[PDB]
Design a protein around this motif. Structure first.
Motif, PDB file in Angstrom:
ATOM      1  N   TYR A  18      48.832  30.473  35.519  1.00 53.98           N
ATOM      2  CA  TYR A  18      47.491  30.920  35.876  1.00 53.98           C
ATOM      3  C   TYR A  18      47.119  30.598  37.318  1.00 53.98           C
ATOM      4  CZ  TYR A  18      47.260  31.184  30.801  1.00 53.98           C
ATOM      5  OH  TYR A  18      47.512  31.469  29.480  1.00 53.98           O
ATOM      6  N   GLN A  20      47.441  32.659  39.960  1.00 52.63           N
ATOM      7  CA  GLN A  20      46.808  33.855  40.501  1.00 52.63           C
ATOM      8  C   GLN A  20      45.835  34.521  39.536  1.00 52.63           C
ATOM      9  OE1 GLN A  20      49.609  36.307  43.068  1.00 52.63           O
ATOM     10  NE2 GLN A  20      51.136  35.306  41.760  1.00 52.63           N
ATOM     11  N   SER A  21      45.708  34.024  38.308  1.00 54.54           N
ATOM     12  CA  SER A  21      44.875  34.675  37.298  1.00 54.54           C
ATOM     13  C   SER A  21      43.411  34.404  37.618  1.00 54.54           C
ATOM     14  CB  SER A  21      45.234  34.178  35.903  1.00 54.54           C
ATOM     15  OG  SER A  21      44.348  34.711  34.935  1.00 54.54           O
ATOM     16  N   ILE A  22      42.725  35.419  38.143  1.00 55.04           N
ATOM     17  CA  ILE A  22      41.298  35.287  38.418  1.00 55.04           C
ATOM     18  C   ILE A  22      40.518  35.140  37.118  1.00 55.04           C
ATOM     19  CG2 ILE A  22      39.277  36.504  39.310  1.00 55.04           C
ATOM     20  CD1 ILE A  22      41.416  37.798  41.346  1.00 55.04           C
ATOM     21  N   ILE A  23      40.965  35.816  36.059  1.00 53.34           N
ATOM     22  CA  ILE A  23      40.217  35.835  34.803  1.00 53.34           C
ATOM     23  C   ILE A  23      40.159  34.438  34.197  1.00 53.34           C
ATOM     24  CG2 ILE A  23      40.264  36.695  32.435  1.00 53.34           C
ATOM     25  CD1 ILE A  23      41.742  39.225  33.871  1.00 53.34           C
ATOM     26  N   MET A  24      41.326  33.822  34.003  1.00 58.19           N
ATOM     27  CA  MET A  24      41.369  32.487  33.422  1.00 58.19           C
ATOM     28  C   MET A  24      40.729  31.465  34.348  1.00 58.19           C
ATOM     29  SD  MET A  24      42.398  31.151  30.542  1.00 58.19           S
ATOM     30  CE  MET A  24      43.800  32.019  29.846  1.00 58.19           C
TER      31      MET A  24
END
Lengths: 157, 460, 376, 125
Positions: A18, A20-24
């Motif tokens: 996570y 690069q995961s903007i959502i998480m």
């Protein structure tokens, strides 16, 4: 990137995918904000459990000790009143009476142990002075003193 | 990459299953995409075929290439047959700040085609000084990237990123400001060249294929009699040149069993094969000429050891369905017929068009496996020949060395279990007049055949 | 969905059928592979297959408890219940380009198709020109019904064709017009519509219908309040307060829709000819006026707010058409005097300048404004 | 068994794939299983406190180890096999291959076999 400290810790606790995961990242930023608010609330609750740092729990403390709850009054005045009310449950020796009155007023007090047969003197000392109204102190002294004794006062800057 | 642990996942279909395959095949494919007028080799990778020639089932390229790959051919030699009128999709993009809208960049497809490749450019929302350069194939996105506004960097970036196997950029002129925003501008002017292929065009593919070497050749799902005759003459000529090419053909869709048998009897060369039944796959009908691609692929993949006498084909349904009498008539006629047996489409008896004569040991020439065996031996013998023609001294020692090499090659064949007995010796008759530039020898071998039929007798 | 009981005959075993067929043979061999077996076994197998599949499917579709699809739709039509139909997603798409460019109705614009996702097709509902300003907005609708569509803000970016001078096509806001109905939900609707009686729209029936709508605590009816068979529906919320305008509209639409078009008719509970209107009683505001005198150091605003809260709590007990006890409000004010909660003294205690118990009539009561007279 | 699906996570981009509606792209049982397998392979063991001891691998710790080339091959096989096989859907994992392309930089292959890949006997009385 996550702003909350607890959010960063909780995100790092998971698998490393996570980055690069903007959502998480946003999800755990929100969760960390909630947990930060809960931790601050817990510290505030730790304050409420005492009369000295009662804060908005000073209303609970006043309701406990039977004092009149009035929010407009000064918080320190309410704290002093609560402490004086709590400390009134033992022998009225000069030490206990002096500390009770000192806690109520907040100014230094020395009980004179007056020379007259059935009187006791009280002397106040405050570097910051006093207001022109101190009647409630006399009311509390009359309520708290032994019945057969009289009282005299003097105040010093 | 940084040191550490890296991992990826792929489907089992994407395994390098090309290992262990055999045989080479050729095709003059009609293709919407890819190089034009040249032969290309594919290692039996469906993704490679998709990249080189697209995935349009309407065009013969992807269709017949997929059937050939399903036949387990080691290497497929594809040639993009074209009609002419060839053009690549092209487009020109222009500058904003110039009020005349100067043309600064020209885009072009990598290969000639007629597919709807398009370009969409929009203002980059993060920064107006940049822009997003998204390139489309029809409504589908195909590549995206954001680039600096200078022309040279735009062209270099469009030619740089990995997913630009479809389009190539080129600078027309230089400018200071980014291209104009546009949406889905087709790369007009291109042409795949598949419209109305001429009969003559196949000859170019044949001549280009002559320089290469392959085990067999099959037509592009076309049953034109003129093309079949031309390919027959071409294969005969190549046989005169020492190149033993095996030809596979299929009759026209409307031809009945009578027409198929007449065609098979009309030309009965052992190097020619006629497909007598249409088939279905993926709910799509396949003409006999189209099925001949898969038949040739299977025959080539089986190589020497295997045979397609009762191979269970990939097809799902056949037409016409023949009775035993019709089956006997077709097989006697040299026609290769697929037959439906309990949900499985199975080729029968491995025959070729050579069935007219069979006047003793020529009987064995009627089957595809025997002809492939003979042609492979001839090719290996020619390969060993070309190392020594006019390049080794023609003394007894050199002739003995050549004989030893041939004998050891046949011993390697023996190790495969292909042959039961063989002998190679000196051709004393021709050796009485041989000279330096060539030597003569003789041989004969007993090939081991695949079991074909069983006769039982129950004594009760 | 209820499990379907099946008759024993329809679930017969293939071997049982074959044995029943072969019971009559006693001279010829009936072994597997024999000619009698050849003649008889496929018949038994086909009988078993047909009897187990087709007849059981017929039984399943016969009743609404287990029917599905068009069969369940028809069984709903038996008692006049239709499943809700889907709608196309709708919204607005922004366009930008050369001013001379013209965009016509029926133009097709789609989302970005990829390997993972296919493109969702949309169509423009209007014809516009960019002549005035470089940017224009065009209404559009999805070409496919259902929840498919309803895309995010900037999803629309692709034009299938190519229009001269168009610089960029971007949707400005997400579309909301898309909607699909569930088979089980429709079956539940069909099975709910099974009431036997109490459908005449009497006072009790209208009260029940008003109560069925959430947020309605109590309901009252006036018969022919405006003549011609008109019906009033006075409603109180769950907390006895005046029903909100949204709740009033909800009950109105439930019992008596008002937005019916020319090609529509009321589907509300009100029968034909029964004119219905939803009403709420008026909320009386009890403004208290007295010459309050507050204790030492007490904030007047805080004490008056506490008194306001106490009186509001008392007034919440009062129902529609109740009586506001002024003499009780006197003691509500005086409770703080008894507890020494700031109020040192008061005089001229009135409610809206009244010194008697006020009787509500078609009115609920709520707290008004607490005003200190401060009489000179 | 009643395994269930999940949402796609494009490991190339490191972001969830979402439809035009904005909802995350739901995926089938097998797709979620493959995503879980890749994630578990990428998750080190004993180090990410959100998980038990069962989840994760120890491939990264093996890099600093002093064991030989073939010993490291066996360790990689054991680690990948143990990490994958905890999932109920897994039947067998094997057919490992290795290629030390450069002097000390390795490429390895493996096959994972599902419970649905099993072959069933056809018989009834």
């Amino acid at each position: 990137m996550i702003a909350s400290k607890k959010g960063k810790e909780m995100l790092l606790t998971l698998s490393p995918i996570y980055e690069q995961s903007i959502i998480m990242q946003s999800l755990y930023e929100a969760i960390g904000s909630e947990f930060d608010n809960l931790e601050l609330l817990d510290e505030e609750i730790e304050l409420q459990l005492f009369p000295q740092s009662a804060t908005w729990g000073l209303g609970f403390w006043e309701n406990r000790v039977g004092l009149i709850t009035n929010l407009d009054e000064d918080m320190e005045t309410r704290r002093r009143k609560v402490i004086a009310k709590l400390q009134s449950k033992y022998i009225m020796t000069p030490k206990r009476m002096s500390m009770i009155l000192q806690s109520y007023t907040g100014a230094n007090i020395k009980i004179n142990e007056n020379i007259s047969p059935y009187t006791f003197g009280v002397e106040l000392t405050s570097t910051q002075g006093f207001p022109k109204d101190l009647e409630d102190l006399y009311k509390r002294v009359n309520v708290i003193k032994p019945s057969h004794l009289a009282v005299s006062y003097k105040l010093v800057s | 990459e940084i040191p550490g642990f890296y991992n990826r996942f792929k489907a089992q279909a994407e395994k390098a299953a090309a290992t262990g395959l055999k045989g080479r095949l050729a095709m003059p494919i009609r293709a919407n995409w890819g190089d034009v007028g040249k032969v290309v080799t594919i290692k039996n990778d469906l993704r490679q075929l998709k990249n080189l020639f697209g995935d349009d089932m309407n065009y013969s390229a992807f269709k017949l290439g997929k059937l050939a790959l399903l036949g387990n051919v080691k290497e497929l030699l594809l040639y993009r047959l074209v009609d002419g009128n060839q053009k690549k999709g092209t487009l020109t993009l222009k500058d904003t700040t110039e009020n005349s809208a100067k043309d600064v960049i020209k885009l072009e497809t990598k290969y000639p085609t007629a597919r709807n490749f398009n370009v969409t450019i929009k203002s980059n929302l993060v920064d107006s000084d940049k822009k997003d350069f998204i390139f489309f194939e029809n409504t589908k996105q195909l590549f995206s990237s954001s680039i600096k506004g200078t022309i040279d960097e735009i062209v270099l970036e469009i030619n740089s990123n990995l997913d630009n196997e479809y389009v190539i950029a080129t600078k027309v002129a230089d400018s200071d400001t980014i291209l104009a925003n546009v949406v889905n501008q087709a790369l007009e002017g291109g042409n795949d060249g598949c419209t109305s292929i001429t009969n003559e065009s196949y000859l170019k593919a044949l001549e280009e294929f002559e320089r290469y070497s392959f085990d067999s050749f099959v037509l592009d799902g076309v049953a034109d009699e003129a093309l079949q005759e031309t390919t027959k003459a071409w294969v005969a000529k190549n046989k005169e040149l020492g190149k033993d090419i095996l030809l596979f053909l299929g009759g026209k869709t409307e031809d009945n069993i009578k027409q198929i048998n007449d065609k098979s009897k009309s030309f009965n060369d052992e190097n020619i094969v006629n497909v007598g039944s249409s088939a279905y796959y993926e709910n799509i009908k396949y003409t006999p000429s189209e099925v001949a691609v898969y038949i040739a692929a299977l025959s080539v993949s089986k190589g020497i050891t295997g045979s397609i006498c009762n191979a269970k084909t990939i097809f799902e349904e056949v037409e016409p369905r023949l009775s035993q009498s019709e089956v006997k008539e077709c097989l006697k006629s040299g026609t290769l017929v697929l037959d439906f047996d309990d949900g499985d489409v199975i080729i029968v008896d491995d025959v070729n068009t050579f069935k007219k004569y069979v006047d003793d040991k020529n009987e064995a020439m009627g089957y595809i496996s025997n002809i492939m065996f003979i042609n492979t031996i001839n090719k290996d013998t020619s390969l060993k020949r070309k190392e020594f023609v006019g390049k080794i001294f023609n003394d007894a020692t050199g002739q003995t060395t050549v004989i030893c090499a041939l004998k050891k090659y046949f011993e390697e064949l023996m190790s495969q279990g292909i042959i039961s007995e063989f002998n190679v010796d000196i051709d004393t008759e021709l050796q009485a007049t041989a000279k330096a530039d060539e030597f003569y020898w003789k041989w004969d071998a007993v090939k081991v055949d695949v079991m074909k039929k069983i006769y039982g007798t129950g004594y009760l | 969905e209820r499990e379907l009981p099946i008759p024993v005959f329809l679930t017969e075993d293939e071997d049982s059928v074959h044995e029943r067929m072969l019971s009559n043979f006693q001279d010829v061999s009936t072994l597997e592979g024999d000619f009698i077996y050849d003649a008889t076994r496929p018949t038994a197998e086909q009988i078993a297959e047909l009897k187990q599949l087709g007849l059981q499917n017929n039984l399943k579709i016969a009743f609404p408890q287990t029917s599905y699809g068009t069969y369940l739709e028809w069984l709903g039509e038996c008692k006049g219940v239709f499943k809700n139909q889907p709608t196309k997603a709708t919204g607005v798409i922004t366009f930008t380009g050369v001013q001379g460019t013209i965009i016509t109705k029926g133009t097709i614009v789609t989302t970005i198709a990829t390997d993972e996702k296919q493109s969702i097709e949309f169509e423009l509902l209007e014809t516009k020109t960019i002549g005035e300003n470089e940017t224009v907005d065009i209404k559009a609708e999805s070409r496919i019904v259902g929840t498919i569509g309803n895309v995010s803000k900037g999803s629309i970016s692709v034009l299938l064709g190519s229009i001269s001078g168009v610089k960029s096509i971007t949707n400005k806001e997400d579309f909301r017009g898309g909607t699909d109905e569930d088979e089980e939900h429709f079956r539940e609707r069909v099975l709910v519509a099974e009431q036997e009686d109490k459908l005449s729209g009497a006072s009790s029936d209208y009260i029940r219908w008003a109560k069925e709508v959430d947020g309605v605590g109590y309901a009252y009816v006036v018969s022919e309040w405006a003549g011609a068979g008109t019906v009033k529906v006075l409603i109180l919320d769950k907390n006895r307060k005046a029903a909100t305008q949204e709740l009033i509209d909800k009950v109105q639409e439930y019992i008596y829709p008002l937005n019916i078009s020319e090609g529509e008719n009321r589907d509300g509970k009100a029968p034909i000819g029964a004119l219905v209107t939803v009403v709420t009683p008026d909320t009386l505001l009890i403004n208290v006026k007295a010459s309050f005198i507050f204790s030492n150091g007490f904030s007047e605003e805080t004490v008056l707010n506490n008194l306001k809260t106490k009186i509001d709590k008392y007034l919440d007990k009062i129902d529609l058409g109740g009586t506001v006890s002024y003499n009780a409000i006197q003691a509500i004010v005086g409770s703080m005097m008894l507890t020494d909660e700031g109020i040192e003294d008061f005089s001229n205690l009135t409610i809206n300048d009244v010194k008697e118990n006020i009787k509500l009539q078609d009115q609920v009561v709520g707290i008004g404004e607490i005003v200190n007279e401060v009489v000179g | 068994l009643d395994l269930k699906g999940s949402f796609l996570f494009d490991f190339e981009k490191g972001e969830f794939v979402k439809n035009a509606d904005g909802t995350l792209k739901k995926c089938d049982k097998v797709q979620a299983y493959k995503q879980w397998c890749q994630k578990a392979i990428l998750t080190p063991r004993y180090k990410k406190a959100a998980y038990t001891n069962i989840y994760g691998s120890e491939i990264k710790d093996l890099i600093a180890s002093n064991l030989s080339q073939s010993a490291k091959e066996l360790e990689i096989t054991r680690l990948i096999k143990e990490t994958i096989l905890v999932h109920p859907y897994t039947k067998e994992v094997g057919e490992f291959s290795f290629n030390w392309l450069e002097n000390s930089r390795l490429v390895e292959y493996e096959f994972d076999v599902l419970t649905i890949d099993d072959e069933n006997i056809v018989i009834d009385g």
